[PDB]
Amino acid sequence: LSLAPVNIFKAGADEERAETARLTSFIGAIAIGDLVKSTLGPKGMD
Amino acid sequence: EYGRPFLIIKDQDRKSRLMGLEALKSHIMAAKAVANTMRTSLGPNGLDKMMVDKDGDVTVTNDGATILSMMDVDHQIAKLMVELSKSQDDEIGDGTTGVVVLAGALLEEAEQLLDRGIHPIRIADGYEQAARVAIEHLDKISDSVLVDIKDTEPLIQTAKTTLGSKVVNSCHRQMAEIAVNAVLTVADMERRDVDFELIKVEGKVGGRLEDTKLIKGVIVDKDFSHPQMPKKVEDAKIAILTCPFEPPKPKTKHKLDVTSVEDYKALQKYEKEKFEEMIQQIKETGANLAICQWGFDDEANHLLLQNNLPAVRWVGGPEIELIAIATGGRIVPRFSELTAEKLGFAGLVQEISFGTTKDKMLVIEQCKNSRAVTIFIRGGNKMIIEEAKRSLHDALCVIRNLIRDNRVVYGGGAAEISCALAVSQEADKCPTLEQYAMRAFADALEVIPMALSENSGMNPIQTMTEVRARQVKEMNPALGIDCLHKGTNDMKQQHVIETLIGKKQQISLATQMVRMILKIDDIRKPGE
Amino acid sequence: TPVILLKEGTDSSQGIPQLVSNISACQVIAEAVRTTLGPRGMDKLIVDGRGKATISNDGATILKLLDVVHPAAKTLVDIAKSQDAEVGDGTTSVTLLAAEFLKQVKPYVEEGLHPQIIIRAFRTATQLAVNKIKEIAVTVKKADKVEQRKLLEKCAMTALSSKLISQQKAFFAKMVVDAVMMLDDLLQLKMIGIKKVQGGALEDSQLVAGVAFKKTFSYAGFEMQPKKYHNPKIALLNVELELKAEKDNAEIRVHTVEDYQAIVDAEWNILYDKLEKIHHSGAKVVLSKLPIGDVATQYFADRDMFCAGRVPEEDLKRTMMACGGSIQTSVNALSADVLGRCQVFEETQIGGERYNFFTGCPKAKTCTFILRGGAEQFMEETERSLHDAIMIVRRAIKNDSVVAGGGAIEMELSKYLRDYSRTIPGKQQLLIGAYAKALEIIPRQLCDNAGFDATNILNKLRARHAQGGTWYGVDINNEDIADNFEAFVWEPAMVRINALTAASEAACLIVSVDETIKNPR
C-alpha cells in the first residue's frame, strides 16, 4: 500500500515519481516568472 | 530447571535476525526497487534524474554511476548495487546503467525457480554455465575494422552512439570530433595506453554550447603580473622557472650579524645587485617570457617590465609540467642552470577576455608536436557544464577501449537477441535440472530490448517478437530496435557500434554479483 | 543479615540446573554457524554498530563478529581462534563437534552421574581416536616432484570447494601451489603480496613473479620520464633526497655577506653530491621510504631515470628478496653487489590505477597476488578463501599424510569406538557409546545443507563400514555414497587430529564447572 514494503532510503530522504515531479518542477518555475513579470517594459513597477 | 531467558549476545533485545527463505525474498524485493528506477534512463529516448545534495546543491545527470552514487540508501543489498555500477565506470566507462538493469532482471527471474523447490546454489551454478555460452558466442559475431590516424571515421561513429543518449545531442557531431582528436594525440601506439593527466578538461560558464573547442596547448587561468605588459606575443621562448625572485635564504637557522656601519652599507649593496643579476641571466640566454611558480617582488616586477620581458606569477604545480611537455622546454630550479637549450617554444601567447567580468585567461598554442591538449567547455548554465564534462569523459573512455581491442559488435539490442538464442538452443541438450536455470538466463537477457521499446513508445512484446522471428529466418545478427523511427531495423546501416569488451563486462560482472545475493541467507543488524 | 558478606548485586548460581543451563547455551553458538558446512553451504551477513557489512562463510570470522557475553559460550569462540592459528582449516567442524559432545551427555547429567566419570571417559575416547587416524593415514614412497605437485593440488582444491570461488577452484589451485614453492624454509606469510583492485572479472586475477605496488605521490615532472626499461638496476635506498636542514639541532652564525652566499651554495652542493653518486653507479630505478623532493624528480627526468618515494616498508622488503639488493642508508658506498636487477619494468593501468611491475626475476623467492573483483566484499571474501589454501599447503609440506573426507573419516572412527565399548563393562559403555554416536554429526549436516534424506543415507554408510570400504564418504552430485579417496577428496591428517583435541578439551572444561559468580560492574 505504501511506497514498496521494504525500506531503501534513510530517514528524512524523499523521492518523487513521474506524475508528481512534473507537478513540482512546473509550479516552481511559473512562480519565479510571475513575481518578475511586473517589472517588464517601459511602465514596469518596482 | 526453568530455562529463563538467559543472556547470550550483548544488546540481545535491540537486535533482529532474518533467516530461511524470508531473508532471500527481501533481497530480491530490494534489488527490484533499485533496478526499476534506472529503467527509464536507458537508450536515446531516456530521461534524466534530478538530484539534490545534502547541503544545498542541485545536479542533473543521465549517467548511471553518479546517480547511484549521490543517492543515499540504507538497505545493505542496495549498497551492493551501487558498487556494481562503480566498478564498471572505472574499468570501461560506458554501460554503468545497463549492468544494474540486467542484474535486477536476473534476480527477478530466479524468484519463480526458488518457489518451486530449487536450491539457490543450483541456480547460481546454472547461471555461470550460461554466461560461458553467451561470451563464447559474442566473439563469433564480432567485427574488427581498423584503428589508426589516416582514415578516422569508424572511431567517430563509435563515439557518436554513446553521445546519442546524453543532453549533448544538438551539437553531438562536433563533440564527437573533439573526443576522437584528443585521444590519438596523447596516446602511445606501442604500449597501448592513455594518460588522462595529459588531457585537461576546463569549463567556463557563460556563452554558447557550440563554442566548445579543442586547444592544442595549455590554457591557464592567470594573467600578467604588471598591468602595462603586452597582452600578446608572436614569438616567445618559454623560460620555465621553479625558484622565486626573492634574494636567497638558506633553510637552516641562519643568523646574519651586523656589528658596524660598513657591514650595513654592504648589505644594501648586496640586495640591489642580486635583483639586477637575475634579469641579466634571463635576458642573456635569449628568453622572451618568464613562468614562475612562486611570487615576484615590488622591485623584481618593474625590472621585468623595463626590459620588455613579460612574465606570469603564481602558477600551479600540475600546470607547470603540462607547459613543459607541450612547449618542449625543461624546468630549471635556479638561475645558474638557465641555458639556451632549456627553453620552450610557443607560436602565440594571448590573454583572452570574457564579458563584463574581470576574468582573464592565458592561452598557449601554435606549437609543434605535442602530448598535452585541453578541452574548453562553454555553456549558459551551471548544470550544462557539469553534465557536458561527464558526457565527454564517457566519449574519451570509449575510444581508449578501442585501442586495446579493435573488435566491436552492433548495439541497439542486436547483441542481446543473438546471445539469448545461443543460450536457449544449447539448453535443449542439458537434461540435468539446468535447463530451467539456462532458460531463465536467456529470459532476463531480453529485458534490454523491452526497455528500449517501452521508452520509445512502441509495444515491447509486439516488436521484440518480430525481431527474433526475422533474425532466425535470415542469417543477420545485426537487427535491433528502431528507437529513432528511421524505417530500417538493420543496425549495420544505421551505424550503431558498441565495443566488444564493453558488452563482455556487462555479462561477466553482472553474473557474479547475483552469486553473492543467492548465497546470503542470514542478516544480523541492530534495531532502530 | 544486617551485615552482608558480598556486595549487593553479586549474582550466584550452582547445582544441576547451573550445568544443564550451560549445555543449552552452547546450542545457540553451534546453530549460528551450522549452515556454512559443505560444498552447498551459505554465508551470513553481519552488521556492526556503524554500518559496515562483513559477508563470510567461515566460522572463525563469524564468531569474532558476535558480541557474545555468556561465560560458558565464550569457550567455543576461543577454540575457534586456536584452530585457525594452528591449521587454518576445519574451524566450523570443531564447533559442531564441541556442541555434539555436550548434547549427547546432557541426559546423563540429569540422572545424577558424577561428572568426573564423564571426564575420564572423554579423555579415554580421544586418545583412542587420535591413534586410529595415524594408523590408517595414507603416505607415499619417494615423493617425486610430479607426485608431490598432484598431492597438493588435490588438497588445495578441496579446501576451496565450499567457498565463494567454487566454480574456479581449478584455476586458483594452480596459483596457490606455485606460490608456496617460491618460499624456501620458513615460509613466511608476509612474502605473499595480496593486492585488491576494483573492477574486472574473477578470471582476470594474475600471479606475478616479482613485486607490484601502487603508484605513490609524485611531484612536478613525473610525467617527463620514461616508463619502460629493459635491464634496469634497482637502487633500494633509505634517504631523504630533498632540500632541507642538515640537522634539526643546528645554528649558523655568519658575519659577512661573502660567507652568506657560500652557505646558500653549500646546501645546493650537498644535495647535488648525493644525486651524482647515484647516477654514476649505473642505476636506472630508485626507491626510497623517505620522501623525494621535486628538485630530485626533475634531476632524474633529465637523465631518463625513474624515481619513487614514500614506499611502504612491507613493499621494499618484498623487492629485496626478489631482486637481490640491500637497503642503503648512505650513498657513500654503492657497489655492484648492492644493486638489484630484473628483466622488465613498466607502469601499466589496471582498473583506473597505476601499478609498477618488476617481473623477470629468475632468483625470485616471493610472489604477489592481484585480485580482480566487483565490490569491496567480493575481494575480502576472496582473500579469506585464499588464506585457507595457503595454510593447508604450508602444513602439507611438513606432513605428507592425507586422509579421505566428506564424512569418510568421521564414520570409521565411530565404528571403532562402538566395537571397543562392547568389551569393557560398567558405566563406560554408555559414555563411550555416546561418544561414537556424536561423531556422525558431520555427515548429517552435509545431507541437511544440500536437502537430502539424512537418515536413509546414513543407514547405507553404517552398513558399508561394518562389513569390511574404509574411505566411503558421501556424494552430493550423485545423491548417494561413493569412494572419496578415488574421488580425489583429500585433506591432511593434521586437520582432524587437532579438531578432536580442541573439541575434547572444550567439552571437558565446561562439565567440570560447578558454580559461577558474577560481580557488579
Ligand SMILES: Nc1ncnc2c1ncn2[C@@H]1O[C@H](COP(=O)(O)OP(=O)(O)O)[C@@H](O)[C@H]1O
Ligand atoms: N542510436 C541508437 N539506436 C539504438 N540503440 C541505441 C542507440 N544509441 C544507444 N543505444 C543503446 O542504448 C543502450 C544504453 O546506453 P546509454 O543509454 O547511453 O547508457 P549506458 O551506455 O551507460 O548503458 C545501449 O545498450 C545501446 O545499445
Ligand SMILES: Nc1ncnc2c1ncn2[C@@H]1O[C@H](COP(=O)(O)OP(=O)(O)O)[C@@H](O)[C@H]1O
Ligand atoms: N567433494 C566433496 N564432497 C563431499 N564433501 C566434501 C567435498 N569436499 C569437502 N567436503 C566436506 O566439506 C567440509 C568443508 O567444510 P568447511 O566449510 O571448509 O569448514 P571449515 O571452513 O571449518 O574448514 C569438509 O568437512 C569436507 O568433509
Ligand SMILES: [Mg+2]
Ligand atoms: Mg551510453
Ligand SMILES: [Mg+2]
Ligand atoms: Mg574448510
